[PDB]
């Protein structure tokens, strides 16, 4: 603990302090105003005889001679508690609830340590959370990154709220962990989650982290890493399967560009940090399974696509980092179909691994393939109906068009408040696939087709 009461220079959000020793990279700094106010700070770099620190709250209303800068000698860390579940904390890590003060056995760096490629194990399960269709078209995988694409006016928040409550593990309900990470959301938007989680009672089983748009950008950047550090603890130490969900990833990306802009760093393509992939790599790459360790860490980062464009850095970069595709479309939402998700542009990788592959259903793997092919053809048949007279389409093609619509009415939306088990999912899939002649469903095996109609 080293405190310096002299500051050499203060320019913008950055303060330079002379005659300082023992500084380190990414070492948090603490500055108390002359009035007594305290502001957290981050040092990029310690040159000899010089200290340069970035303040999250800002340098507004700071006097150099009067101010005192104290070092704390560690990177940003979150005290982790086993009983942390059922409690909600800010980006800084202090519970907004002001419930009983948290008692952390240990403190560890938010960045955490990268998992060894050899020591890493392949994901082997699927929570079958939320919508049946989402899961059948593509299966969520334990310890697998899951990129959800969202847009303004799209009900992305309802989905995140739905998935959490809907998410469950079939083998055991004893050790299931859910982590709702909130980023750059309004107080009212933030309260929706807090209320939805409390009303459903699924909040006690899920540690919550809330970020406000008014909070310092660095505080908004730190939250994703803190939610993961807590999630890692539960999976790696408690042995509980942990599910982490992040919303409004654009705000994280937009908060990072703000901090980069203030640092006068070169903006990459489209005004985003050129190394955003690498920065977005760490937190996304955290999710996975470790050999010899019980449980797994499933991540479902949700980001808002701007101008409904897939080529934006965040949606594009995330696609490379995350594993799979989850895309929403305005047209399906305009239909009022909730949850509005488009299956064509959205494919989870690996869908097949590890769900089921055949664990979900005997013919589940085969069923999804025939279903997608029929839909993809149904959409083409519907499009042809727009170009030419609807009567022009062949009779057999008209069934496909009818299938595509009937697929969308039940399969595309099961409501924001309704859950469907795996079995119910597929019974619906088979009933909906029943329209097409048995000879039409060529992809599917004969034994499976006979058993299910």
């Amino acid at each position: 603990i080293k405190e310096y009461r002299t500051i050499k220079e203060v320019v913008g959000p950055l303060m330079a302090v002379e005659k300082v020793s023992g500084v380190k990279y990414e070492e948090l700094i603490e500055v108390r105003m002359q009035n007594g106010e305290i502001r957290r700070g981050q040092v990029l770099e310690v040159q000899e005889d010089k200290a340069m620190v970035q303040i999250f709250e800002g340098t507004s209303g700071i006097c150099l001679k009067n101010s005192s800068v104290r070092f704390l000698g560690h990177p940003l860390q979150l005290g982790v508690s086993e009983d942390m579940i059922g409690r909600v904390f800010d980006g800084l890590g202090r519970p907004k609830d002001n419930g009983p003060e948290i008692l952390p056995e240990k403190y560890l760096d938010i960045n955490g340590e990268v998992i060894n490629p050899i020591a890493r194990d392949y994901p082997d399960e699927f929570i079958q959370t939320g919508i049946s269709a989402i899961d059948h078209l593509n299966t969520l995988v334990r310890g697998q990154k899951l990129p959800v694409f969202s847009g303004s006016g799209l009900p992305h928040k309802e989905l995140a709220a739905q998935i959490a409550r809907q998410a469950t593990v079939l083998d055991s309900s004893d050790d299931f962990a859910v982590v709702f990470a909130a980023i750059g959301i309004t107080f009212e938007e933030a309260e929706f989650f807090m209320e939805d989680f409390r009303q459903t009672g699924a909040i006690d089983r899920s540690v919550m982290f809330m970020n406000l748009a008014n909070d310092p950008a660095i505080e908004r950047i730190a939250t994703p890493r803190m939610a993961l550090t807590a999630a890692e603890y539960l999976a790696y130490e408690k042995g509980m399967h942990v599910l982490v969900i992040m919303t409004d990833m654009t705000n994280y990306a937009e908060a990072l560009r703000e901090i980069s802009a203030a640092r006068r760093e070169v903006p990459g393509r489209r005004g985003y940090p050129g190394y955003l992939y690498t920065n977005l790599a760490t937190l996304f790459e955290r999710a996975g399974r470790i050999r010899g360790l019980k449980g797994s860490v499933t991540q479902i980062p949700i980001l808002t696509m701007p101008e409904d464009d897939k080529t934006h850095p965040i949606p594009d970069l995330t696609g490379y980092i995350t594993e799979g595709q989850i895309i929403l479309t305005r047209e399906l939402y305009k239909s009022g179909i909730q949850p509005p998700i488009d299956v064509l542009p959205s494919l989870s990788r690996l869908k097949d691994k590890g769900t089921g592959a055949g664990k979900t259903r005997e013919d589940h793997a085969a069923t999804m393939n025939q279903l997608f092919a029929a839909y993809a053809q149904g959409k083409q048949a519907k499009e042809l109906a727009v170009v030419l007279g609807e009567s022009a389409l062949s009779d057999i093609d008209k069934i496909y068009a009818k299938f595509a619509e009937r697929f969308e009415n039940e399969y595309v939306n099961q409501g924001f408040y309704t859950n469907r088990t795996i079995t119910e999912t597929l019974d619906l899939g088979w009933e909906l696939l029943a329209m097409l002649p048995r000879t039409e469903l060529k992809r599917i095996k004969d034994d499976l087709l006979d058993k299910y109609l």
Binding site: G12, S60, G61, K65, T186, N214, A217, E258, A261
Partner: protein
């Protein structure tokens, strides 16, 4: 005092400025023109001046205010007009003896010399906590000013007294840990920093502006944020006037800069003309008004909203509902973009700062329903309405988009509807309100009738018209089924009566909550009655004929006095009777 080391254009750095904190206002040169300091050497400070730096050289004396840009809160603050930095304009003319603004002239935000009668409600020796109210002073007839304990001070008041003092004199002396503390009436708090609250609550209480479309189609909850388009001719000013004068809130704050001299002058002259119906006094008396031209200092224009919001906070902290209307927010952001270029920061999107969204958050987040400080735990809520005018023609302006995200209410002014002289000129299809579902519960409970069914059904008819309008161009209206033909007619009635509202007529321009229900019901009653009559028996034409008398009364039903509320609800009897009469 710091000597001016070097001075070029709007940048100024002065020596021996170590004591001055960052972001502190300063007086530069013999003139002592107001400047802002973002940087220190130390000790040389990189001050920034908005006023012209012509006639300034090396060796000039510089004074530091010793504090960041803040708002002087205290008795007499209301009913007067101040700039974005809160320096008064009316007080300026008297002191300057000149219309033109004078450089290097500093005027007290609040008049210290003016004496306002103090009535101390609290007793002697009572415990003081932050946010507590020692007594009340009345600077305006419409609004009773209240005095809260200054932040950061806690103790036991040995003496309390009610007498006539100027704001500078200490009215009472409260003990503190450091020692005896004497607190003046006047209160100073940084404009940029948000005010302290004990807790923040979800506003589930709908606000009534007296406008049918707003209260039914897009209701704004307390402390809610609404964004409105700035195309000219939209009657936005009329809409803004109607909100302010018919607002439930006790205070209506007007901020934003800088309107054009001819554009801004209108406000300073027209806004005072407004008279609050309930009080019977000038609308100016209830709330402060901030007016800046585009000539005004960039910070005054850039920190206008932060100044305006802070004034609303103080009166909000008093537990009173406030409403701050800023026009135009795009002008404010335009001043921010300019400041960005001056600071030489990296450009974001459309030349705006990358942290523009963060700036919008702070201002918009402070608005809402929150519990005020003090043992009383009284609560005030500031409902802020912001008007954006990008002039880009694009709906994808960074200001509009970043504002639309944080705000949960979208109002849409269309010039097309304005050209049709449709008042209020708000586009229901282009406007969306996320609050409308939350407002439903409050209405249903209060109305004792399900208001949500009516509102949700109202949209379907309006939404159906848009779908049907495309069909009308393709094929004649007569070709469409009588069922489809009814929706057009039913939609028209809502538009003609519920949508079209004259802002000049008192009874028309302001509609009570109970009356909005009856007006909508008689239109919705027609739908179910005509549809049942339309499906079987009588043709569409037959149902339209002979219904002129009843429909005409529905058309003019909005003109019915609020007292005679039952008279307008009498349409259901006639509509029901008319349907029976058609069948022979």
């Amino acid at each position: 005092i710091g000597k001016i080391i070097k001075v070029s254009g709007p940048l100024v750095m002065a020596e021996n400025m170590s004591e001055a904190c960052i972001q502190d206002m300063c007086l530069v040169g013999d003139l002592g023109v107001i400047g802002e300091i973002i940087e220190m050497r130390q000790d040389v400070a990189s001050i920034q001046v908005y006023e012209e730096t012509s006639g300034i050289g090396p060796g000039e004396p510089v004074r530091s205010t010793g504090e960041a840009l803040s708002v002087e809160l205290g008795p007499g603050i209301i009913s007067q007009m101040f700039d974005g930095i809160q320096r008064p304009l009316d007080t300026f003319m008297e002191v300057t003896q000149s219309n033109f603004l004078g450089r290097g002239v500093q005027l007290p935000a609040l008049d210290h010399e003016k004496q306002w009668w103090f009535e101390a409600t609290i007793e002697e020796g009572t415990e003081v906590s932050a946010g507590d109210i020692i007594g009340y002073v009345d600077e305006t007839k419409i609004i009773q000013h209240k005095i809260m304990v200054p932040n950061g001070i806690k103790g036991t008041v040995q003496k309390i007294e009610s007498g006539s003092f100027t704001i500078d004199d200490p009215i009472c002396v409260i003990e503190t840990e450091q020692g005896l503390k004497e607190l003046t009436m006047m209160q100073k708090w940084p404009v940029r920093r948000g005010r302290p609250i004990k807790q923040k609550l979800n506003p589930d209480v709908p606000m009534i502006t007296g406008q049918r479309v707003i209260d039914t189609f897009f209701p704004v909850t307390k402390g809610g944020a609404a964004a409105v388009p700035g195309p000219f001719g939209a009657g936005k000013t009329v809409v803004q006037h109607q909100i302010a004068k018919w607002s439930d809130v006790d205070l209506v704050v007007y901020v934003g800069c800088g309107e054009r001299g001819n554009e801004m002058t209108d406000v300073v002259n027209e806004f005072p003309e407004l008279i609050d119906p309930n009080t019977g006094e000038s609308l100016m008396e209830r709330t402060v008004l901030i007016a800046n031209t585009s000539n005004m200092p960039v910070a005054a224009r850039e920190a206008s909203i932060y100044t305006g919001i802070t004034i609303a906070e103080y009166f909000r902290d008093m537990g009173y509902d406030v409403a701050i209307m800023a026009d135009s927010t795009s002008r404010w952001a335009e001043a921010l973009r300019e400041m960005s270029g001056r600071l030489e920061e990296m450009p974001g999107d459309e030349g705006y700062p990358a942290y523009l969204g963060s700036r919008l958050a702070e201002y918009y987040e402070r608005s809402g329903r929150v519990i005020a400080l003090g043992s009383d735990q009284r609560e005030g809520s500031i409902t802020a309405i912001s008007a954006v005018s990008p002039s880009g023609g694009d709906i994808s302006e960074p200001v509009t988009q970043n504002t639309l995200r944080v705000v949960k209410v979208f109002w849409g002014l269309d010039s097309s509807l304005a050209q049709k002289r449709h008042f209020p000129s708000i586009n229901w299809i282009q406007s969306y309100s996320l609050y409308s579902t939350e407002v439903g519960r409050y209405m249903d409970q209060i109305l004792q009738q399900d208001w949500s069914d009516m509102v949700t059904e109202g949209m379907r008819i309006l939404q159906e018209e848009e779908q049907l309008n495309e069909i009308v161009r393709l094929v004649g209206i007569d070709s469409l089924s009588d069922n489809d033909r009814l929706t057009l007619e039913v939609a028209k009635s809502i538009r003609e009566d519920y949508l079209q509202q004259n802002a000049f007529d008192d009874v028309d321009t302001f509609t009570s909550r109970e009356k909005q229900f009856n007006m909508l019901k008689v239109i919705l009653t027609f739908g179910k009655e005509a549809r049942k009559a339309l499906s079987l028996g009588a043709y569409f034409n037959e149902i339209m004929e002979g219904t002129v008398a009843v429909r005409e009364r529905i058309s003019r039903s909005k003109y019915i006095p609020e007292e005679e509320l039952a008279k307008i609800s009498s349409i259901n009897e006639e509509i029901k009777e008319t349907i029976q009469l058609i069948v022979s």
